[PDB]
């Protein structure tokens, strides 16, 4: 029993409490999201890793079900409670309809959850941004992503997190579909995106794909070493 | 700078209502005409980003299967008000046998623009515009988050709201044709936006009669905009 | 000093003190009446004035003597539409350990319970203390009387003798000059006293129509309320 | 009530919690008392004053027994006593009933303090201003514990609550020692009692229960009278 | 009515919390614990705040609380709050073992938790937990594993961490000397003794004023052990030993 | 200025000011006069129009067979308090099998905007009504306020500049009782137009007249039958 | 800064205030400060005032 | 001020200021006395007409709760037809359960326990009524109360409400009370509104005056107005 409404209107004419949950979103750490015809690729900056101690808890790539891959922003506790609530029920559409979950219901599930939150009364708003990768039925793959007002969108080339705007830069200038062409040129191109953000020594750097048929396959940090290198190797050819 | 949310000005007025009436004014623009032919309608997308894929933006939205709408404002307190104008024709239907007439819809959907509260939240951030074709021939409602239903013969809101509606008096009689209102808007359009007008900033939906199914798609837009 | 809100609710002040509960102490003294209860050996009498005035007005509707059940009196000082509220309060838990119990209340066991009720008040935040007095006689099987007294604030204890209502420290001292002489308490000495008290504290030496007697009797359990004719009587006879 | 139940008892910038620091005031200037374990009992004593000869002492009992080898005392205000009193009076039922047996003095005091500090989190009230003290002699070794208004429980030797507890700590802290007997116990903590009274002590002025193994047994004024004799 | 509201629940102006962060803020005052595992075995390292000569300790457990056949916490912060997540978060291990007859694993069993502590931070303005704690215990899946938790509800997987923020120097000590897979039962226990002699101020380290819990997988048991005296005595004198056997080069 | 926010709040003065403001909120309304006579319930309401091709907002609003209202006020309390009316008139009709009559039915709207002029978090309806009713003891003139009094009137108007229009009603309430239609509405919406500026007037686009009598159930006329009604007008002089 | 001693009548009697231009007064401006540079012919200035409120 | 906005809290000597606001409230409205003879109570409400502003007989504050009560409220006039539905609600229940007629020392204490009830929470504000009860009875003969927005209920010979309070009952304790038919009362009511409110501020106003007692049978009615109307023509007799 509470009854105290907390987002209320502004005299200019807007709100308080969505803009100031954005700010966490701006506080966080940065998560890009490219997409093919054929793969997909997230990856995800800033692991900041104490390098003594566990990791296998402080990943933060999930997936819903067999298709649907998750990349967030913001706090981390808020972020919890959207995937176990998204977790069931991508399981509970599975029961009556016997697809698989396609992307967009999922995606209009978790913004209809963070309208009505933001709009009922006690409630403080999320504080997360999340990037919801999957590929449908019929090979298409396609990546959304949300807000913490409740929108959302579909994106070809998403960023987030703490300086998403140079990346949004970075990535507004390469608007090649040849990019999008060569499997490991996609990989290496969020390498040379997020090494653009980041200092990226090698160690802070977790990029995940999807190859539309398969779970998702953290790759190996040899990998990213082999990736990086051919990325110096490719750039080191400007003159 | 924290008063009661539910309290009338000492001039008389409402606070908070007074706000949400504001927050429209930075929404998308969108153009509305009835005629005896059909109602036609459009609205602009605002596109930010050539990234963001254009069609997953809609502002035309369907209601049964001769009403549609045109949300201004924020966009997710508009999905609230569609689902539930969606379902409360088929009440209609599935009590009734016949189809809910538009301004009967309208009168469903502004019940609760103004109940909230704390027993029993705050009011809604969008402007409307349902159009169809019902029993009484062509149609064309407005409201507001104040509740405030009214019927239009031509109503323009969003950004360009008070430019959009003076220019659209200039040049607006009660004998228009269907195809002489759709390209009278798009001139309104192009004059009171930003970009360029192309197939993919602006999008048209159009109710007639015979052809209630209302379908507009590219490949005739782009016949629209090349023989204007 | 005041931090937060501690002048206004029933919240601590950095002084480990609060205040709404000592200001509704002497929102007694708004009524402007005092009240004076004295236990003797054998009876427990309270003695109360009341001021009328207007003439317009009855002289039956007036007085602050309750009977909360056949064998417990009380008398209300503080504000009146608070009084009467307390008193339903006691005449319906009085009821309810008859239909429980099997057996009379005891004097004591009920200011319990109403100091109980006024405790929650203090302690729920967002309601009022009631600020109104209470004071209780009776007589005990294997005890005697009793006499009584419960506060706003929730504490209760046994007496001797003593008043109650605006004028305390003065009749209070009388009361205690009183006693410790260790006199005699039959019944007629235990009246006459209840009234000299409060005779010499106002300074009034009144007429006998303003004052009210409650006593109660080891020999007559019953609460009774004294004539005026016998209320006359009593004061001729202690006049010389 | 509406719905409010919002707690009126937030962090400081600091980050210490303000009521509770506050009402901790309120238990230190209250009625000084004293609590001495003794390796066969446990002895309460309290320091009962009146502030006139009007008063009556048969009427109003600190010394309370809670089931019939459990004693309690408090040393902060009067009326919050006695809530939290009879809420241990049927917290103790609800193990007799299940358990069918007498409730250990530990798992009171696990409850107690329980109610007490989900009381402060809960909106709309104030804490408690109590701090209890808690005895008994259950499964051969006696005990002796202290609760707070923030809900925390200790487990003393000898400790003093009230006014001057800071000089009543020295003095039993040279008073003590590894062990003595019940009476030897009853002596000092009068002895503890009496650095902070004042002319009179009567019968009347301080009251006094104990613990044995035997059971909880409060003492009467007569006994008191006789043990003051040739005190401290 | 409204006016007493304090408001727990808004964003910071800043754009970031305002009431959780001053409950981290104040969380590293006053408790000092730790945890350490390389190999079979792991400990947890409490300090005991205040050792006056008028306590009993019939407990003989004060900070560690064994809450499951296979796990345990070392819990810093208000005691009263400490209560209620305790008996809380052995009565969720104990539901999960009634209802699959299997014991609860050890990272179901702190997000069970995390996720209580973060509802009373959103919704109903009520006052946020104080409390940061620990955990050890053995599994069928990984083994040996530490967690940290906070009163956001936020926690993590590690393997040297704390508490308390005068042990800030300590996790400075751990990056500095810490061994992979070299834990013996002598290693990680000399290591803990050596850390809490220079980060707390208690000179020479007095018996009394620590309290160190082990965890050993004996057949099928998971024995919980709690050393008591002595040997905690004999391990400070083989420190001072090892110290002062080494100094002889200087 | 802080005790003009809540409607629990008294004044030191002895008003409650969140009454008063929503006094003022019926005054931001458009006119309507009602009146009545022997048989008749006339109420004659006057429109208004956002836009030059919007329609006019309607006013006068049917209710049962015998009882209209016009309104005053905001647009959701008008629907809410409506939703109210219809429901109280079929539930009498379903129990009792006959028409409420007025009085009785004014006494309950009186009830039921008086809870919220008194709890915490509740706005008082800042609307008023004009009641025009006819029952077994004759027609019937009522109207209402936020305040919650209800008032047995002859002839009354609210909304703005409705004093020139109670200026008008009081130098010719003699005439009231002894005429019948015609020169029953052509008294009453003279009375409207002097609610006007000097430059327009009633246009058939921006009137509705109620009428409810004896052998006469509730009828609205609007903008095709409001021309049989204005001819043997005047203009106003000058 | 209003000096009544002023506005006794013999001194300073009428009041003319400026206000702000509702849209073409905005737009004259514009068309004021483009003439005498270098912009395209092509393009429009009521779209650059709608965006200038203030 | 800062202490005079909720009904909780109190002031810093003790009172509190929103039944103080609320009972000037009161003070600022119109007159109505009520008086008993020996066989019955007479009501009378002087009220205001502007110019015409309503009917002849319109919202009369003359209210009729039970067969055998009467009201005389005054104050805001739509919280004192809450009182009046909560007063039938209440004489109602007591006919259902029991079966003899409310007794008017119940209907008293029953309405101004609800009255006291809306003085202590932050949520609700207290009323601002104040209104007369007057009844009849052979086996009681007639009472009078008098209820304040306090709760304050007690018993009056004569009593007055409005802005004349003082000025009213100045003369009314100048007649008798026992020595009196009502019918003589009735035109002795009238003379009283007739005495007061000269019409400085208002020209217009009316008399409404109800009777109930030994000659109505207990029924309360009002009096036969325009039957025999000899109030008025006596009441303008007064002229020097």
Not at chain 3, 62 to 77: A, D, P, R, S, Y
Not at chain 8, 46 to 58: A, D, P, T
């Amino acid at each position: 029993s509470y009854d105290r409404a907390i987002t209320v209107f502004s005299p200019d004419g807007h709100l308080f409490q969505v803009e100031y949950a954005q700010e966490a979103v701006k506080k966080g750490s940065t998560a890009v999201g490219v997409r093919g015809r054929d793969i997909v690729v997230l990856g995800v900056e800033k692991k900041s890793v104490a390098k003594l101690q566990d990791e296998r808890t402080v990943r933060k790539i999930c997936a819903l079900d067999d298709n649907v891959c998750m990349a967030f922003a913001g706090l981390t506790a808020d972020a919890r409670i959207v995937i176990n609530r998204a977790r069931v029920e991508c399981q509970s559409h599975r029961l009556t309809v016997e697809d698989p979950v396609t992307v967009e219901y999922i995606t209009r599930y978790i913004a209809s959850l963070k309208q009505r939150y933001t709009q009922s009364n006690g409630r403080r708003p999320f504080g997360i941004s999340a990037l919801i990768v999957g590929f449908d039925f019929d090979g298409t793959p396609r990546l959304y992503q949300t807000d913490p007002s409740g929108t959302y969108h579909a994106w070809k080339a998403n960023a987030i997190g703490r300086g998403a705007k140079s990346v949004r830069e970075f990535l507004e200038k390469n608007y090649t579909d040849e990019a999008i062409e060569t499997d490991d040129l996609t990989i290496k191109l969020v390498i040379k995106a997020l090494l653009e953000v980041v200092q990226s020594g090698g160690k802070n750097i977790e990029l995940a794909v999807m190859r539309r048929d398969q779970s998702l396959k953290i790759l190996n940090p040899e990998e990213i070493e082999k990736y990086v290198a051919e990325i110096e190797k490719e750039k080191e050819e400007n003159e | 700078y924290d008063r009661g949310v539910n309290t009338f000005s000492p001039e008389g007025r409402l606070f908070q209502v007074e706000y949400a009436i504001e927050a429209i004014k930075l929404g998308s623009t969108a153009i509305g005409i009835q005629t005896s032919e059909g109602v036609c309608l459009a609205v602009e997308k605002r596109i930010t980003s050539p990234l963001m894929e254009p069609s997953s933006i809609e502002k035309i939205v369907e209601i049964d299967a001769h009403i549609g709408c045109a949300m201004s404002g924020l966009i997710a307190d508009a999905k609230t008000l569609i689902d539930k104008a969606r379902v409360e024709t088929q009440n209609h239907w599935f009590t009734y046998n016949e189809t809910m007439t538009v301004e009967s819809v309208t009168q469903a959907v502004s019940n609760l623009a103004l109940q909230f509260g704390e027993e029993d939240s705050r009011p809604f951030g969008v402007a409307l515009l349902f159009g169809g074709v019902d029993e009484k021939g062509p149609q064309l409602f407005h409201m507001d988050p104040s509740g405030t239903f009214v019927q239009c013969d031509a109503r323009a809101i969003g950004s360009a709201s008070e430019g959009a509606q003076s220019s659209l008096q200039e040049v607006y009689h009660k004998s228009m044709t269907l195809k002489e209102a759709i390209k009278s808007s798009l001139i309104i359009l192009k004059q009171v936006m930003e970009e360029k007008l192309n197939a993919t900033n602006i999008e048209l939906a159009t109710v007639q009669p015979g052809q209630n199914f209302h379908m507009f798609t590219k490949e005739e837009l782009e016949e629209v905009i090349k023989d204007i | 000093s005041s931090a937060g809100f501690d002048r206004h609710i029933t919240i601590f002040s950095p002084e480990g003190r609060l205040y709404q509960v000592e200001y509704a102490f002497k929102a007694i003294n708004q009524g402007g009446l005092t009240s004076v209860a004295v236990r003797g050996k054998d009876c427990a009498v309270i003695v109360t004035q009341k001021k009328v005035p207007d003439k317009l007005l009855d002289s039956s509707t007036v007085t602050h003597l309750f009977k909360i059940t056949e064998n417990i009196g009380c008398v209300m000082t503080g504000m009146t539409a608070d009084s009467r509220s307390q008193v339903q309060r006691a005449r319906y838990e009085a009821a309810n350990w008859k239909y429980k119990y099997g057996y009379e209340i005891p004097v004591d066991m009920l200011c319990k319970r109403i100091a109980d009720i006024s405790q929650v008040y203090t302690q729920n935040a967002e309601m009022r203390p009631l600020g109104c007095c209470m004071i209780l006689i009776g007589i005990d099987e294997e005890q005697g009387p009793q006499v009584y007294k419960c506060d706003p604030a929730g504490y209760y204890c046994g007496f001797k003798a003593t008043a109650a209502g605006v004028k305390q420290t003065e009749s209070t001292s009388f009361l205690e000059k009183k006693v410790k002489k260790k006199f005699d308490w039959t019944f007629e000495q235990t009246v006459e006293t209840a009234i000299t008290c409060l005779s010499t504290v106002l300074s009034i030496d009144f007429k006998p129509s303003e004052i009210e007697v409650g006593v109660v009797t080891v020999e007559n359990p019953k609460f009774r309320i004294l004539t005026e004719a016998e209320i006359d009587a009593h004061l001729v006879a202690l006049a010389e | 009530e509406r719905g409010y139940s919002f707690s009126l008892t937030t962090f400081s910038p600091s980050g210490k919690l303000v009521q509770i620091e506050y009402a901790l005031a309120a238990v230190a200037g209250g009625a000084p008392s004293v609590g001495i374990k003794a390796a066969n009992g446990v002895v309460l004593a309290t320091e009962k004053k009146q502030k006139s000869i009007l008063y009556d002492e048969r009427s109003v009992h600190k010394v309370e027994p809670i089931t019939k080898h459990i004693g309690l005392v408090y040393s902060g205000m009067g009326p919050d006593y006695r809530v939290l009193v009879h809420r241990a009076r049927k917290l103790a039922q609800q193990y007799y009933l299940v358990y069918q047996e007498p409730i250990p003095t530990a798992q009171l005091v696990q409850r107690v303090a329980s109610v007490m500090q989900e009381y402060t989190q809960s909106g709309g009230v104030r804490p408690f201003g109590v701090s209890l003290l808690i005895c008994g002699w259950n499964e051969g070794r006696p005990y002796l514990f202290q609760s707070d208004p923030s809900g925390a429980y200790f487990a003393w030797k000898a400790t003093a609550m009230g006014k001057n507890y800071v000089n009543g700590k020295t003095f039993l802290e040279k008073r003590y020692n590894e062990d003595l007997e019940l009476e030897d116990a009853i002596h000092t903590a009068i002895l503890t009692l009496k650095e902070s009274f004042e002319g009179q002590m009567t019968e009347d002025n301080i009251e006094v229960g104990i613990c044995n193994e035997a059971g909880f047994r409060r003492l009467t004024p007569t006994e008191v009278k006789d043990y003051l004799a040739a005190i401290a | 009515s409204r006016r007493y509201d304090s408001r727990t629940t808004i964003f910071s102006p800043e754009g970031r919390l305002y009431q959780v962060e001053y409950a981290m803020e104040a969380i590293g005052h006053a408790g000092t614990c730790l945890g350490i595992l390389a190999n079979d075995g792991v400990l947890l390292a409490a300090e005991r705040r205040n050792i006056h000569k008028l306590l009993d300790e019939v407990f003989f457990s004060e900070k560690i609380y064994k809450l499951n056949e296979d796990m345990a916490c070392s819990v810093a912060g208000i005691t009263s709050d400490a209560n209620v997540l305790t008996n809380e978060l052995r009565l969720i291990a104990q539901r999960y073992l009634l209802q699959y007859q299997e014991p609860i694993p050890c990272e179901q069993l702190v997000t069970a938790l995390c996720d209580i502590k973060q509802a009373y931070t959103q919704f109903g303005g009520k006052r946020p937990f104080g409390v940061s704690l620990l955990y050890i215990g053995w599994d069928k899946h990984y083994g040996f594993q530490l967690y940290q938790s906070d009163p956001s509800g936020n926690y993590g997987g590690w393997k040297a961490t704390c508490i308390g923020n005068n042990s800030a120097a300590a996790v400075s000590m751990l990056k500095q000397d810490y061994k992979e897979g070299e834990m013996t039962l002598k290693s990680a226990l000399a290591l803990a003794i050596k850390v809490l002699n220079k980060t707390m101020d208690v000179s020479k380290l007095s018996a009394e004023k620590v309290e160190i819990a082990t965890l050993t997988r004996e057949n099928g048991k998971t024995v919980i052990r709690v050393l008591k005296q002595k040997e905690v005595e004999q391990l400070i004198k083989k420190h001072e030993e090892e110290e002062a056997k080494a100094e002889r080069e200087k | 200025n802080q005790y003009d926010n809540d409607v629990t709040v008294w004044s030191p003065q002895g008003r409650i000011h969140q009454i008063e403001y929503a006094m003022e909120a019926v005054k931001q309304g458009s006119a309507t006069v009602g009146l009545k006579s022997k048989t008749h319930a006339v109420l004659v309401a006057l429109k208004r129009a956002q836009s030059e091709l919007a329609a006019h907002q309607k006013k006068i609003l049917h209710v049962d067979n015998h009882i209209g209202i016009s309104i005053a006020g905001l647009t959701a309390d008008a629907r809410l308090l409506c939703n109210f009316m219809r429901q109280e008139c079929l539930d009498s009709r379903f129990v009792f099998d006959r028409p409420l009559p007025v009085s009785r039915l004014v006494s309950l709207i009186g009830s039921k905007t008086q809870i919220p002029t008194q709890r915490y978090g509740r706005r008082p309806y800042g609307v008023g009504l004009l009641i025009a009713g006819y029952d077994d003891m004759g027609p019937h003139i009522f109207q209402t306020c936020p305040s919650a009094n209800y008032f047995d009137c002859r002839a009354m108007s609210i909304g703005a500049r409705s004093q020139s229009a109670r200026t008008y009603l009081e130098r010719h309430m003699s005439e009231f009782m002894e005429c019948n239609l015609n020169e029953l509405v052509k008294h009453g919406l003279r009375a409207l137009r002097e609610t006007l500026p000097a430059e327009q007037d009633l246009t058939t686009k921006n009137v509705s007249i109620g009428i409810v009598g004896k052998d006469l159930e509730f009828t609205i006329y609007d903008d095709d039958d409001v021309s049989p009604f204005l001819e043997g007008l005047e203009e106003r002089p000058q | 800064t209003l000096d009544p001693a002023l506005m006794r009548p013999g001194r300073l009697d009428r009041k003319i205030e400026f206000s702000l231009p509702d849209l073409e007064g905005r737009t004259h401006i514009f068309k004021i400060h483009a003439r005498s540079m270098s912009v395209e012919r092509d393009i429009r200035f009521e779209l650059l005032a709608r965006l200038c409120p203030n | 001020t800062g202490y005079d906005l909720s009904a909780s809290t109190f002031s810093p000597d003790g009172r509190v200021f929103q039944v103080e606001y609320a009972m000037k409230a009161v003070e600022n409205s119109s007159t109505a006395i009520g008086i008993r003879c020996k066989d019955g109570v007479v009501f009378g409400v002087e009220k205001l007409v502007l110019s015409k502003l309503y009917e002849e007989g319109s919202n009369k504050r003359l209210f009729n709760v039970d067969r055998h009560v009467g009201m005389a409220v005054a104050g805001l006039l739509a919280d004192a037809r809450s009182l009046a539905d909560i007063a039938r609600e209440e004489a109602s229940n007591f006919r259902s359960n029991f079966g003899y007629n409310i007794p008017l020392k119940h209907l008293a204490d029953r309405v101004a326990m609800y009255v006291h009830a809306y003085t202590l929470y932050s949520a609700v504000r207290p009323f601002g009524c104040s209104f007369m009860l007057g009844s009849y009875s052979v086996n009681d003969g007639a009472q009078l109360y008098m209820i304040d927005p306090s709760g304050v209920s007690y018993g009056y010979w004569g009593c007055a409400i409005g802005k004349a309070r003082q000025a009213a009952k100045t003369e009314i304790e100048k007649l008798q009370m026992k020595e009196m038919t009502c019918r003589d009362i009735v035109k002795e009511v009238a003379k009283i509104i007739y005495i007061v409110h000269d019409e400085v501020k208002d020209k217009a106003f009316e008399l409404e005056l109800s009777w109930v007692g030994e000659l109505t049978n207990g029924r309360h009615e009002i009096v036969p107005k325009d039957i025999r109307e000899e109030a008025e023509k006596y009441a303008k007799e007064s002229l020097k």
